[PDB]
C-alpha cells in the first residue's frame, strides 16, 4: 500500500491514506495510557465514539529507558490491537518537550543537565525546559526517534500508523528564550542567511533584524530547527507525514511570551516556523478555548495555503463537539478530542468534569454524520467545494440568565430578535445559498432560539452546479437562489436520503412534503441528503 | 503454622499471622448474630466489604447454658464457614462484662447475686454490674473461658481464630467502684506491692496513695486483675493474642467516672491497666465519636510504645471510613467497623441510619486500597516508616451552611482561604515532604474546598531514601524537598502504578504528564503508586 502523505495543491490539502483523501475522526488518550495494561481502558471509548484513528503517546523514556537499550514492546502490542480493531494510529513522540518540559525523556537525559542543558532565565535561574541549543540533546532525541521509525519501517508495512507528532507542545513557560552563555553567543551572532532570504529581510544580528520580537523569534527559530532535524532524520527512515502541535496563545489577547508557551507555533511565529522547518508537514492547534469566537479565530489562523488544518487536540467537554463542523468546512483533515479513555482522570477545567458514556456520546453523534461518507467527503473537500458551520452562540451563562431575568419586557423582545439573527448563518454555494438556523420546530417558521446546550451544525459539499450533499445536526438548512432570478421561480427539485456503498450513491427515501416545506430539519439522528435545486420559467 | 502473636519492638508493633505481619481489615457483627442461623446474614456483607477478618461474639450463656454442660456447636459451624470463605476470626468473649453488665452470662450466673455479686453503690443500692472482687465469678468465667480455649486448641490448629477479646467494654455505669463491705475492706487495705513498685510510688492504702483518683483507680485495678487472670488461664491452653476493648470517655471533656464506664481502660487509667494486666496484649479503643479532632486524639492516646493500636470497633456510618488512614498511619494493626450484617438492626445514632449496600461500600472503597498490598504494608509499618492522614474537616453543618450564605463577600473569601488551609496537611518523609489536599480538580491549582461528605485520605510508606509507596482517596498528594536544596532543582523521577504479585512489584503503567503535573490525584478508585523523587544539579 502506498505511504500516507500530506498533499497541498491550489491552496487546499488532503491527508492521503491508502491512496485517497482521509479524515481523521479521532480520539486521543490521556497522558498515562501509553502502556499495554492501559489499552483495555482505551478501546471501548474508541468503539463507542466511532473514531477511526487513535492518537496515543510513545515516550522516549519507555523506548530507551537505558541508553541505547531499546524497548518497543508497547508499540508491538499497540499495533496489533489497533489492527484487530481496524483503526489507524497517530503516534505522539513525547521526548525533548512535552508541554515545555522533559518529563518523558529517560532519567539519564532529564537528570543530566550538564550533558542536556536547560533554559536559563535572564536573572540566572534555571527552568525545567530543555534548551533547543543543546547539541547533545538533539543528537540523542534524533537517535531514539530514528529507532522508532526503523521499528515502523520493519513492522508496519501496511501503515497502521499514518502520521507522527514530533514532540508535544514545545516551548518554554516562565521565560521567552534561553539566556545561557551558549544561547547568548548565538543570539549575538548573525541571523542565519536562509531565514533572512526566506523572510525578505536585511541581514543582521537577532536584535538588529527583529527588534522587540528578537527573543521570541529566536526561541521559535531554534526550536523549529531542532524539530525539523528530528523530523528529517525520521523521514529518511520512513517518510510518514509529521507535524507539531501548539499550546495556543489567545489570539485576541495573548499576553506575553513565557506566560504562554514561548517558541511553539503560536500565531505570531508561524512565518518563522514555516521558514525554519520546511520538512514538518503542518502545525496543528490544540484547542481548549470553549467560546465560539475564539475557536473560530484559531481555525482561521491555522488554516492557510501553506498549512493544512488538523485539530490535533480539542477539549472533550460537550461544547467542543460542534467544532467538528467548521473544522471540516475549512478543509480540515482531522479532529481529535483529548482524554477519551477511562483511566480515571479528568482534565477539567480544560475538558469534561466527568467521564462517562454521555461524554463520549456528544462526539459519537457528530462522528455518525461523517463516518458514512468519510472518503467521499475527504475527496470533495480536497478537490471541490465544501462548507461547514457550528452554532455560533455559546450556551447562556448563569450571569446572562440573571441579566436576562432583570431585563425590561421591551429589552427581552429585543434580545430574542438579536439572538435569532445571531443564530442565522448564510452560505454562498454558487448559484444557490443556504441559510442555517438553530433551535426551532421542524414545521412552520417561528424564529430560532438556539439549542440548550449549544450544539448544532451543518456540512455541505457541492456535487454539481445545482446539487449538494448535506448533513446537519440540531439545525435547519434552507436553500434559496444566490442571485435574483429574472422572471424565473425556484424550488427544490429533489431531496434524497441515502448512503454511499462501494463509492456509489444508494437512495433510501425521498424527502418531500412536510420534510421539505420548511427547510431541511435535523435533530440528533444522522441523515445524509443529496439536494438538487432548480430554477424554472413561468413566462 | 506458627501461632499468631503480637510483637512489640523499638516502640513499634506487629500482629504476626502465619509468620508475618498482618492487618485486620475487619467487620464486626451486631450483638445478636452469634448463632448458626444468623451467619447467612453476616457473610454476604463481609464479601461486599472485602474484609479479611470477622469479629463476632461467643457468649458464656451459649457455651455453658447449664453449669458444667458445655456446648460448642456455634463455634464448630463458625470455624467451618469462615474457612470455606478463607477469612480469619476474632472471637469476642461476652461473659462477666458486656457493656458493664452480665446479660450474656448464663442464667445460673446472672440471676444468683449471692454467689456472683453486683457492685453496690455508696448509698447501698445495687447496680447490674458484677463486682470484680467476686471470687466465685472470676473462677466460673475463667473455667468457661478455659473450655473455649481448649476447643480452639483441639479444633483450630491452623489458627482460623487469630485473636480473642476478653470481655466486652468492662466497667460500671452509675458508680465509680464497688462500695460493698467486701470491696470496702480491700479499698481500706494497702495498695498491692506490685502496683506500687511498677508505678514508682510510696506505699499506702488506696486513699493515701491515689487521693481524689482512689475510687476510679481501684475499680480499674480490680477489673484489670480479673481480666488478666482470665487471660492467663486461657493463654496457658492456647497462647493466642488477647485484648480488651474500651467504652471510651471523651478525651477532651470526659465528665465523671460512672457517667462514662468507670474502670475500663479509659485514657486516665491506662497506666493502671498496663501495670495490673501484663498478660493482656493490648487495650483497644471503641470509637463512636464522629468528629475528626476527637477521633484523632483517641488514636494518639491509644498508640503508645507499650500499646499497639487496634480499632476494635468503630461506627459504620460514612464519616468513619476515612479513619482507616490515620489508623494505619500510626502503625495500627487493624480496624473493625461495628454492625456489618443484615440482621435488621441499626445502632443509629452511633452508626448508620440505614443498612444497605451503600453503607458497606463506603468501607469497601477504602479496604480496596489496602487489600492488594496488605502484607507489604504490614511489614513496612512494623519495620519501616509509614504515614496516614484523613480529611481533617468534618462535613459542613446546616448551621455552618446558613452562616456561610449570610456572610459578607470579604468574609466568604476569608472563610474559603481558612478552609483551604485547614484542608492542607504536611508530612515530613525525610529528604522529601508530601502535601495532602482534599476536594479539588485533577488539573491546575485551584485551592481545596473539601469533599462532600468529608471522605478523603492518604497512605504513604517509605521504600528508600527517595522512593515511596503511595495510595490515596479523594485527595491530591504532592511531593517537595524537605530541606532547601542548594543550587539543585528537583522533580519526580518516576511514578509507576502497579501491584504486588508473590511479594514482587509488577508495573502496570507510568503516570506522567497531566497525571503528575499537578500532584498525584486520586478519586474513589484504587491506584497503588511507587513514587521516586530526584534532586539534580543545574550548576
Ligand atoms: Na453566489
Ligand atoms: Na525532613
Ligand atoms: Na525538613
Author numbering:
A (entry chain A), B (entry chain C): 37 to 575
What do the study authors state?
Genome walking in silico revealed the presence of open reading frames encoding a predicted β-galactosidase from glycoside hydrolase (GH) family 35 (CjBgl35A, encoded by locus tag CJA_2707, bgl35A), a predicted TonB-dependent receptor (TBDR, encoded by CJA_2709), and a predicted α-l-fucosidase from glycoside hydrolase family 95 (CjAfc95A, encoded by CJA_2710, afc95A) upstream from the gene encoding the known α-xylosidase CjXyl31A (CJA_2706, xyl31A). The data indicate that CjBgl35A acts strictly as an exo-galactosidase that requires terminal galactosyl moieties on XyGOs. Rather, the specificity of CjBgl35A is similar to plant β-galactosidases with a general ability to remove side-chain galactosyl units from xyloglucan polysaccharides; the GH35 member from A. thaliana, Bgal10 (At5g63810) produces XXLG and XXXG sequentially due to a preference for the underlined side-chain in XLLG (Sampedro et al., 2012 and references therein). The liberated XyGOs are then imported into the periplasm via the TBDR, where the exo-glycosidases CjXyl31A, CjBgl35A, and CjAfc95A work in concert, together with a currently unidentified β-glucosidase(s), to yield monosaccharides for further catabolism.
Given its poor sequence similarity to other GH35 enzymes (vide supra), this two-domain fold exhibits low homology to other currently known protein structures; only one significant structural match to another bacterial GH35 β-galactosidase, from Caulobacter crescentus strain CB15, was found. The (β/α)8 structure of the CjBgl35A N-terminal catalytic domain reveals a centrally positioned cleft running laterally across the open end of the barrel. This topology appears to be consistent with the requirement for binding of extended, branched oligo/polysaccharide substrates such as XyGOs and/or XyG and thus the cleft was anticipated to contain the catalytic active site. Despite the observation of separate protein domains, it seems likely that these together solely constitute a catalytic module, i.e. a distinct biochemical/biological function is not indicated. Structure/sequence homology searching of the C-terminal region in isolation produced no significant results that would indicate similarity to known regulatory or carbohydrate-binding modules (CBMs), despite the observation of a trough-like surface somewhat reminiscent of a substrate recognition cleft. In addition, the observation that the early part of the C-terminal domain is formed from a distortion of the final helix of the barrel domain, and that the initial β-strand of this domain stacks directly against the penultimate barrel helix, strongly suggests a rigid, monolithic structure.
